[PDB]
Amino acid sequence: EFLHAQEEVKRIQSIPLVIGQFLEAVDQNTAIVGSTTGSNYYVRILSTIDRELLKPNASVALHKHSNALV
């Protein structure tokens, strides 16, 4: 049942997404990130790897609706 929940979060958010630019990490599990239009939003980061893929500045794909960091 937990592995079934792991398959869930592995799919999510799947597709589609929108390209954005990461600005900085304000705290853990959430950070501010800009979109392609340059819209800085408050977004919960994905809980798998919070370190090596976060980066000081990087181009990140954000969800179509939630604009989530994955």
Interacting residues with another protein (CB under 8 A): 4, 7-9, 11-12, 15-19, 32, 35-44, 47, 61, 63-68
How near is the Cβ of 56 to another protein at its closest, in Å?
A: 18
Which has the closest alpha carbon to 42: 26, 61, 60, 53?
Answer: 26
CB nearer to another protein: pick between 38 and 56: 38
How near is the Cβ of 28 to another protein at its closest, in Å?
A: 13
Question: Do the beta carbons of residue 31 and residue 41 sit within 8 Å?
Answer: no
Cα–Cα distance between 25 and 57 in angstroms, integer?
A: 10
